[PDB]
């Protein structure tokens, strides 16, 4: 298990039950209603959403090793997925200072 980081989600990481990424006044929240929401302020203010409200009571969001972002229910069925997939590898989802959530990967190189 990778430790939780405020503004970034790494491949294999999961979010559920109102956990979020945050920077500045932006939040990316995996709500308890199965909806993944990017909000600012919030002037209760939604910039982007999965639009999956009401598809589950115990949904989680996961970033995969192909850059895929899935929202999934307790039964392990997918209720939303991002269109993409890339080369198998390690990816990152970053909540940016510009108000975008972006997935980057795979790893090109590392200091390790």
């Amino acid at each position: 298990n990778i430790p939780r980081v405020r503004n970034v989600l790494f491949s294999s990481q999961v979010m559920y039950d109102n956990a979020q990424l945050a920077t500045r006044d932006y939040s990316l929240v995996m709500r308890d209603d199965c909806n993944l929401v990017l909000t600012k302020g919030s002037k209760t203010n939604i910039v982007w959403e999965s639009g999956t409200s009401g598809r589950g009571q115990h949904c989680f969001m996961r970033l995969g090793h192909s850059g895929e972002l899935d929202i999934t229910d307790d039964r392990l069925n997918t209720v939303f997925v991002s269109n993409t997939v890339g080369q198998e590898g390690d990816y990152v989802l970053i909540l940016q200072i510009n108000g975008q959530a972006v997935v980057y990967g795979p790893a090109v190189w590392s200091t390790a």
């Binding site: 980081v5 790494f10 910039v47 972006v102 090109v108 190189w109 200091t111």
Partner: protein, 110 residues
């Protein structure tokens, strides 16, 4: 955010990425060094430039630039076969800097 460097952004002289105990510093001596409780990393670029700055390019490479020269002091990796695009350097909980890209999905700007 201090744990992230995106393509086209710069780390100025004696500025750094940090997360927790780890730092990736663009030093005044022109050396770029990762300080961590572990195995560090250096560009080994001591004294090769003046007022040096660091940028992440559109191919996922770091470039150290010098005030006194037009072409970069160092580029790493020296050669890559990446798509031109947007990349991100992240100083992770692992105490290392990993470069990821290109961008493959995003929410609408902005």
């Amino acid at each position: 955010d201090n744990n992230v460097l995106l393509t086209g952004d710069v780390i100025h002289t004696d500025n750094q990425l940090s997360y927790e105990s780890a730092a990736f510093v663009m030093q005044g001596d022109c050396n770029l060094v990762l300080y961590n409780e572990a195995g560090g990393f250096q560009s080994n670029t001591h004294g090769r430039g003046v007022d040096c700055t660091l940028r992440l390019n559109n191919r996922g490479q770091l470039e150290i630039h010098s005030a006194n020269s037009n072409t970069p002091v160092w580029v790493y990796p020296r050669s890559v076969n990446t798509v031109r695009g947007n990349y991100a350097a992240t100083l992770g909980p692992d105490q290392h800097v990993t470069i990821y890209g290109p961008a493959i999905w995003s929410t609408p700007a902005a």
